[PDB]
Ligand binder design. Structure first.
Ligand SMILES: Nc1ncnc2c1ncn2[C@@H]1O[C@H](COP(=O)(O)OP(=O)(O)O)[C@@H](O)[C@H]1O
Ligand SMILES: Nc1ncnc2c1ncn2[C@@H]1O[C@H](COP(=O)(O)OP(=O)(O)O)[C@@H](O)[C@H]1O
Ligand code: ICS
Ligand code: CLF
Ligand code: SF4
Ligand code: SF4
Ligand code: FES
Ligand code: FES
Ligand SMILES: [Fe+3]
Ligand SMILES: [Mg+2]
Ligand SMILES: [Mg+2]
Lengths: 121, 272, 522, 477, 121, 283
């Protein structure tokens, strides 16, 4: 799994290689490589770790489970439209905006964009 | 149904002015709804006679998620048939402080608390910073009318200017307009016409001037609002006149921001 | 094509000409199958001694195991208590598989619940899962007790049940006085019998650890009995009958035979029988505690000796003649009651049956597998019948158990060829029965695929299977039989001798070929 | 009919639950309205199960190893992790195949890593590599290896993908790692998606540069039929008699070559939407292969599906379809004439997770039986969109029904027959209601096609009309 | 070189492998993979092949030459800030917006985004 | 079995009415036709669907979030026996106005509306300017036969010249050809012969000349095609003749664009503009 971190704070986009399916989340991957995603909670109820995930290999999109807590948090910051919620519920496809502490790395190439601010502007 | 919001810096009598406005409106047979978009849980204590109304965020946290939340426990009716909603924020340093406003507005829309033959909805919004869930009513075109509570102090006028800029930014995407500038007195010389001059400088009209007195505090001790504490009070009738001017207001304009030096010169040439 | 008067199931409908042609077309066209000559050559290779050596050089891959995971035994232990709900903190697939396994074996309903832990619980733990599951289970199914075990998911992420249960009790999810015993049953340690031991120790410690001040050994003049992982209802019934026949006061702990044999009378009894909580509270007042399967009950033995101050006897499983006699004599010595004439008559009848059938049983070669205590008892009984065990297999055995079985074999002239294997699986046993052909196999239904394999080599290389153990899926109501005591020995002897006689009858059925030995009297 | 008292019955059953459990479970019980095209406004599915309510759902490992990957015969499937997960799933599903077991077919076998504590603590990947080497040593005739991961594999942290890549490059053989951990997903539904993704990413694109296969304009592929009791063969014989040639079967009695050759097919015949719609959609987007759903349960649905399939080809295929329909008409007509009088007007409740309850309803109605309640443990909202038209008005719909809810519904409704799995079979056999094992066809079958309709009718007659059901109550009671 | 083509016209982003430094430009790579970037000239003056190129591996950014024709076309389109012109002129670093017909593939991971319209809205 | 055709021209001359009437006439012959309105005005399916305005693909994609979730049934509306779809356009001031066309056709091709279950597919395209989106059906080989509506106006024939320039530019990579010129009366005396000469210069023909009839407004007041309103009127006969000659059209030529001076002299030749002289420039 290849992950490309991007941020206006970062002078250069950073390419890392990650092991998929780890109990440690994308937040573990970000912390090991020194990517400064704001993590301000230990229960996954805040929105500080909001990121935008783009699947570079569109053919290799893996089906996942959108947890109810993550869905509620994404709706709380207004980053989950109705169409994407229905898509996650029916087709088991991920939404565009995710939470780093709740995101499980999959075996694909990903682009993770963050702006350094907590979710909800 | 008319959607109005009350903005301005924190500490300027915003909450109590909004409470007196809505209670006065309820005295005329109108039915109003209050949504407290301030992280401080004090936006609805003077119309429910409670220590602190339990917020939507607190109930959602205690009841697991917001999907298990019921409308009856969050919508409390007070004096005059007013509907009360209280939107608490998260703890300091835990994410955006404006998640509560977004969650509460979404919950209210989902449970259909607006269409119930309401005429006035009032969003008591923090105006120290215009961002996140605090600029959300302007971003989403939720509050069509907005009133700013300010005084003859640099912080209040700067907050009014910032809210005006926020209105200008989202002017083209919806019908969000600045109705007027509510003025609250701190017993300082030459304040009324200073605020009239600011309003005329940025295009609006002054709505009403509220002087400072001790009756509102005596009512505040009793967890009481001024009008139905003593309806014959002079300040009670002033609040009634403020309500009359608010309901019969038809001027909706797009303001123009004023620069820092302009505000400094305006403050300087008025003796302060 | 079907005839409405003679409707055919899959067999032999798929033996028709059209279906055969369709399958041949499929294989020849779109399968890229290896040539039949290559398949036959590789199959013949798999039955050689070099392939056996390669098979026994295995260290990482295990094929066709003969053991399960701990929470299965934990649920079986939990089912034996009165109005007790088995609860598995972890994923729901574990509970689904446990329920399917036990339903397929016992052909009876099995009740168990899970907290349905998910990716969210994988990331943030399962405290809320435990609270909500306990509350929901108590509110809905109304159990007098909830017995909590763990799934490998909960074991890896370090979910500790003590703090979770105390938090649930003190936050109002369940009453503080509601009994919720717990145990940690990792699936990567031991097997199902280890889970049974862990759960029984957990329940005993929950009910007796904090009330050891007014307990005096021998006050209630009863004898505690711990059966262990038992999947035969007759094994509970025979122990109850033998103990009640001697006039010995006893207390069976964790007996699920009542809930596992409910009658069908238009009503569904989700709870039935089982040991009450009072008998668990009064357990350390007993004169002594007897462990029926001590090789998988070691931890509960430590708990009973250290805490209950009971001198646990050194007894084997009551299988066969000598070990049943030793069990009866030890029980008589502990309880002070004499062995009655009925048990002497039963033992004499067993000896009569042994002498009547000794001719057909002598010199027969057996390859058996199962659980440590059951396998040891079976090997002992086979030694007392003059039979010759050859391949003894135990996937969940240890070095001490293997040493004990070797000592048992050394004390009999019929155990020279016998060799004991621990940590091996059923593929190893297939290689063993191919290269060193025994007469019969003795084990669960998973051995049937071995028999077929042997039949593929030839009719004279086939090794028939005898279904004694757990689980038995291809036969009906074999879980109602007995293996312990004189009754169990009688049933085992009858099964063995009749299997031998049926095999001999089959081998001599060809007219004018081998029917000269098709004797009417055997 | 009678929607009011079934509504009140739902209310009474939901009374024992705590407030949160009641609130969630209220969304999953519905009253069927055939005039509804969007079930999302009536029922809600694909949500997590409430803890401690005796759900019937399984895990994603069951939906990937036991459902999609298991029936493939010439591959070796390694249950990576502790022994129990592969032990309880061994030979439990009657996916039929033709092959020499242990030589070139390995369906009934159980290959597992058998993790211990030292494997849980110290890695485990090198054990996987050594296991692959041993598998290649002892089983040379296998045509691939899949590694179905169990719960601890993701939890401890393991890279089975790098091991798969390295060993596949070293041994020149395809290795497919499947992250089908039990905790991923609320039911078996996500296991289907994970297995489909694994097939798409590691198997399906193998024969992309190859053009040595001689394809004909009548090529088809059976997708979503897992040959339970020989179901796929009964469908295959009907498809071949219609003039079509089938090169792939997914995945009952399937092989690696059929999966690799599937992209060279003119039409995808999807039987089970729930388990293979992902791969069907992918093959439609990439290779441009159209796909449709068909039903072979009962004579009416079989004729409808045969005509619909023939409508996608030239006139000769339609004439052949007419020939086979005329040939098989007297068979099922005789079966109906013999068995409908004994089964006419009897009510049945169904609870099979996934595609089977909507599909079986036509076969039931063919014998004059009426389905009064139905439901799926793991079906999504599109399945409920599809099944509302099939079911009768004011009939009961449930999703992920608990044991207590199902027992109370059965006691109140009192149907003549219940078709469900093994976990509820004996529960309802105790209460004196005839029961059929829909998942396994009660160790009978096949039920697909005209050949399967006779066995279906005979089984339902033998179970519903058995005398044992009249002796439940003692004469002195 | 790994190139990820993304566009609102494409249902899925495509991952392609390209030979670096080829005389055929990004336009050759786009055409041979069926990526529909609007090419509307052969002298490189129309500007309809405008794309946004993001170097996913920030460390592996290769210096290049921004020809005067590309610079003039980008100015005529408006996708060329003065800061990016100065950066390209002094540090020989590529701008954010490029022309596919005039862009030579470098040995790095690239994300190429286009809206399907000609350059210049 | 499918003939892909486009109708171009300057906005305001009658592309929509002529296209809808042509489809109405074609449907009488048992043909199955489909209409795509690539004009941001979004009124090219008004007279067929009898509605106030067909919802555009962009509007549906905005209200639903994306174009991938959009169905065919809410996008394709069947009226008068013919299918209708509207491309729409983005908000004026942002993006490219033709982008909706690019969003529409692409979407259609992925949903299956472009499968050959139809005899005629028509694109009413705005041709006042030839840019991306409005030249995409020419650039991407999505319109075999182009017909240009033109009046006796300078701007109309300028637009015809520009569209022909685009066609000849994209003539070597595809089969996009100019099938003829359609003239709509502007109450000009010499306009018929004027566009006759224009087509002769361009190397193409008139398919037909359409008279200005006040009954077309009477048909539009009912949101109706003139063919259905009076089947027996002479305007309906002219439209039917135009349709039959469109079907029987076999002259598909690459046009020969003329210069500005040639267009100016062609306008001079027929009296629309007076005679210019060099000695009368400064007075
Ligand atoms: N008209 C008034 N006269 C005197 N004191 C006032 C008046 N309005 C507000 N205040 C004082 O100003 C303070 C403002 O607090 P409050 O209105 O509750 O919230 P906020 O800080 O948001 O304005 C109050 O404590 C009140 O005592
Ligand atoms: N054949 C015709 N005769 C008379 N008037 C017409 C004819 N065709 C169109 N018109 C008039 O032209 C006006 C606008 O034409 P329209 O079709 O909207 O232009 P466009 O070609 O840009 O779609 C309409 O109001 C209509 O009345
Ligand atoms: S795959 Fe599914 S539960 Fe579609 S996991 Fe399950 S052999 Fe069922 S209703 Mo067992 S979605 Fe197949 C099924 Fe149906 S195993 Fe079989 S019977 S048609
Ligand atoms: S949900 Fe699925 S089947 Fe369950 S464990 Fe998880 S992957 Fe497996 Fe197998 S081993 Fe035993 S039964 Fe479990 S507790 Fe550890
Ligand atoms: S947007 Fe405003 S409220 Fe939200 S985190 Fe930033 S400063 Fe705080
Ligand atoms: S290409 Fe044409 S239609 Fe598109 S933005 Fe440019 S000028 Fe406008
Ligand atoms: S750190 Fe708070 S949601 Fe991830
Ligand atoms: S193709 Fe025109 S500038 Fe590149
Ligand atoms: Fe039974
Ligand atoms: Mg306040
Ligand atoms: Mg038009």
């Amino acid at each position: 799994a290849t992950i490309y971190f991007s941020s206006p704070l970062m002078p250069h986009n950073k390419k890392v290689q990650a092991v998929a399916g780890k109990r440690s989340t994308k937040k573990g991957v970000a912390q090991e490589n020194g990517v400064k995603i704001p993590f301000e909670c230990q229960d996954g109820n805040c929105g500080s770790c909001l990121v935008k995930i783009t699947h570079l290999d569109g053919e290799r999109i893996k089906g996942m489970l959108l947890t109810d807590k993550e869905r509620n948090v994404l709706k709380s910051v207004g980053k989950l439209p109705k169409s994407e919620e229905e898509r996650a519920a029916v087709r088991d496809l991920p939404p565009t905006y995710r939470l780093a502490c709740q995101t499980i790395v999959t075996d694909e190439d990903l682009l993770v964009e963050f702006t350094g601010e907590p979710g909800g502007a | 149904m008319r959607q109005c919001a009350i903005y301005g810096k924190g500490g300027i009598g915003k909450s109590t002015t909004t409470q007196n406005l809505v209670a006065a409106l309820a005295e005329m047979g109108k039915k109003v709804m209050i949504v407290g978009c301030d992280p401080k849980a004090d936006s609805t204590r003077l119309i429910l006679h409670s220590k602190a109304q339990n917020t939507i965020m607190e109930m959602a946290a205690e009841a697991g998620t917001v999907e298990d939340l019921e409308l009856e426990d969050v919508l409390k009716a007070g004096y005059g048939g007013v509907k009360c909603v209280e939107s608490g924020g998260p703890e300091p340093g835990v994410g955006c402080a404006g998640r509560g406003v977004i969650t509460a507005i979404n919950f209210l829309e989902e449970e259909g608390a607006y269409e119930d033959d309401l005429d006035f909805v009032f969003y008591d919004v923090l105006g120290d910073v215009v961002c996140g869930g605090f600029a959300m009513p302007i971003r989403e075109n939720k509050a069509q009318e907005i009133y700013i509570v300010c005084s003859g102090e640099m912080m209040a006028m700067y907050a009014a200017n910032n809210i005006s800029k926020g209105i200008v930014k989202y002017a083209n995407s919806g019908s969000v307009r600045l109705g007027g500038l509510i003025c609250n007195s701190r017993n300082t010389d030459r304040e009324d016409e200073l605020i009239i001059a600011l309003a005329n400088k940025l295009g609006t009209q002054m709505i009403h001037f509220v002087p400072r007195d001790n009756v509102v505090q005596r009512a505040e001790i009793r967890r009481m609002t001024v009008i139905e504490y003593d309806p014959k009070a002079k300040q009670a009738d002033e609040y009634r006149a403020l309500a009359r001017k608010v309901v019969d207001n038809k001027l909706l304009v797009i303001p123009n921001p004023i620069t820092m030096d302009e505000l400094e010169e305006l403050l300087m040439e008025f003796g302060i | 094509s079907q005839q409405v008067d003679k409707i055919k199931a899959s067999y032999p409908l798929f033996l028709d000409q059209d279906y055969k042609d369709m399958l041949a077309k499929k294989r020849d066209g779109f399968e890229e199958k290896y040539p039949q000559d290559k398949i036959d050559e590789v199959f013949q290779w798999t039955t050689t001694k070099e392939y056996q050596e390669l098979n026994f050089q295995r260290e990482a891959l295990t094929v066709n195991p003969a053991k399960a995971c701990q929470p299965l035994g934990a649920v079986l232990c939990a089912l034996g208590f009165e109005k007790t709900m088995p609860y598995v903190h972890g994923s729901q697939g574990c509970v689904a598989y446990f329920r399917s396994y036990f339903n397929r074996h016992f052909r009876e309903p099995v009740s168990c619940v899970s907290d349905s832990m998910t990716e969210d619980a994988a990331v943030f733990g399962g405290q809320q899962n435990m609270k909500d599951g306990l509350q929901n289970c108590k509110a809905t199914y109304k159990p007098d007790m909830i017995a909590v075990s763990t799934t490998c998911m909960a074991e890896v992420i370090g979910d500790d049940l003590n703090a979770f249960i105390n938090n649930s009790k003190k936050e109002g999810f369940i009453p503080d006085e509601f009994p919720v015993p717990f145990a940690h049953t990792p699936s990567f340690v031991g097997s199902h019998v280890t889970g049974w031991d862990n759960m029984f120790e957990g329940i005993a410690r929950y009910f007796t650890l904090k009330s050891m001040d007014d307990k005096v050994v021998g006050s209630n003049k009863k004898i505690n009995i711990v059966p262990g992982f038992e999947t035969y209802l007759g094994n509970f019934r025979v122990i109850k009958r033998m103990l009640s026949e001697m006039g010995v006061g006893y207390s069976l702990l964790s007996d699920p035979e009542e809930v596992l044999d409910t009658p069908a009378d238009g009503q569904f009894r989700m709870y039935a029988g089982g040991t009450t909580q009072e008998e668990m509270k009064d357990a350390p007042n007993a004169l002594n505690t007897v462990l029926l399967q001590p090789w998988h009950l070691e931890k509960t033995k430590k708990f009973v000796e250290g805490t209950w101050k009971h001198e646990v006897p050194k007894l084997n499983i009551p299988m066969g003649l000598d070990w049943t006699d030793e069990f009866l004599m030890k029980v008589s010595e502990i309880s002070g009651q004499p062995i009655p004439a009925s048990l002497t008559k039963e033992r004499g009848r067993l000896v009569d049956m042994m002498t009547d059938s000794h001719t057909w049983l002598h010199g027969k070669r057996f390859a058996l597998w199962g659980d440590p205590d059951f396998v040891m008892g079976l090997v002992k009984f086979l030694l007392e019948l003059g039979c010759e065990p050859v391949h003894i297999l135990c996937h969940n055995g240890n070095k001490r158990w293997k040493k004990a079985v070797d000592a048992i074999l050394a004390a009999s002239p019929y155990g020279k060829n016998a060799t004991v294997y621990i940590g091996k699986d059923l593929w190893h046993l297939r290689s063993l029965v191919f290269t060193d052909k025994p007469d019969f196999m003795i084990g669960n239904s998973y051995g049937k695929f071995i028999q077929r394999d042997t039949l593929h080599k030839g009719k004279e290389f086939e090794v028939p299977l005898i279904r004694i153990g757990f689980p038995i899926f291809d036969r009906h109501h074999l879980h109602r039989s007995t293996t312990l005591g004189y009754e169990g020995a009688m049933q085992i002897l009858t099964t063995l001798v009749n299997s031998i006689l049926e095999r001999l009858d089959e081998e001599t059925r060809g007219m004018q070929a081998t029917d000269y030995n098709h004797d009417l009297v055997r | 009919m009678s929607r009011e008292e079934v509504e009140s019955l739902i209310q009474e059953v939901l009374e024992v639950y705590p407030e949160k459990a009641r609130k969630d479970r209220n969304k999953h019980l519905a009253v069927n309205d055939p005039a509804v095209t969007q079930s999302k406004k009536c029922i809600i599915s694909n949500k997590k199960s409430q803890p401690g309510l005796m759900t019937i759902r399984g895990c994603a490992y069951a939906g990937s190893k036991g459902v999609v990957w298991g029936p493939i015969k010439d591959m070796i499937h390694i249950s990576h992790g502790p022994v129990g997960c592969g032990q309880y799933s061994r030979a439990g599903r009657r996916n039929y195949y033709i092959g020499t077991t242990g030589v070139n077919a390995f369906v009934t076998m159980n290959f597992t890593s058998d993790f211990q504590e030292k494997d849980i603590v110290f890695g485990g990947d090198k054990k996987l590599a050594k296991l692959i080497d041993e598998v290649e040593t002892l089983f040379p005739l296998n045509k691939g290896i899949s590694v179905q991961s169990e719960c601890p594999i993701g939890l401890i942290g393991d890279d089975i993908e790098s091991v798969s890549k390295v060993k596949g490059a070293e041994l020149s053989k395809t290795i497919v790692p499947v992250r089908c951990e039990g905790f991923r997903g609320v039911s078996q539904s996500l296991g289907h998606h994970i297995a489909n993704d694994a097939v798409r990413d590691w198997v399906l694109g193998k024969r992309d540069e190859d053009t040595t296969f001689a394809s004909t304009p009548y090529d088809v592929a059976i997708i979503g039929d897992y040959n339970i009791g020989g179901d796929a063969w009964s469908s295959r014989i009907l498809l071949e008699e219609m003039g079509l040639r089938c090169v792939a079967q997914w995945s009952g009695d399937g092989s690696i070559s059929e999966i690799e050759l599937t992209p060279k097919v003119k039409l995808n015949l999807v039987h089970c939407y729930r388990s293979m719609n992902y791969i069907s959609r992918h093959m439609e987007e990439k290779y441009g292969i159209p796909w449709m759903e068909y039903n072979f349960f009962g004579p009416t649905k079989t004729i409808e599906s045969l005509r619909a399939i023939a409508a996608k080809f030239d006139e000769s295929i339609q004439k052949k379809c007419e020939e086979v329909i005329a040939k098989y008409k007297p068979e099922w007509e005789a079966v109906v004439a013999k068995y409908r009088p004994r089964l006419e007007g009897k009510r049945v409740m169904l609870y099979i997770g996934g595609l089977r309850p909507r599909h079986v309803i036509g076969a039931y109605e063919d014998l004059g039986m009426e389905v009064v309640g139905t439901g799926y443990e793991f079906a999504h909202n599109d399945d409920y969109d599809r099944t509302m038209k099939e079911m009768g008005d004011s009939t009961l719909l449930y999703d992920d029904v608990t044991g207590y809810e199902f027992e109370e519904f059965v006691k109140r409704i009192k149907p003549d027959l219940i078709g469900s799995g093994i976990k509820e079979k004996f529960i309802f056999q105790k209460m004196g209601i005839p029961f059929r094992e829909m998942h396994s066809w009660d160790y009978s079958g096949p039920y697909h096609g005209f050949d399967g309709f006779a066995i279906f009718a005979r089984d339902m007659d033998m179970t519903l009309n058995n005398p044992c059901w009249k002796k439940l109550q003692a004469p002195w009671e």
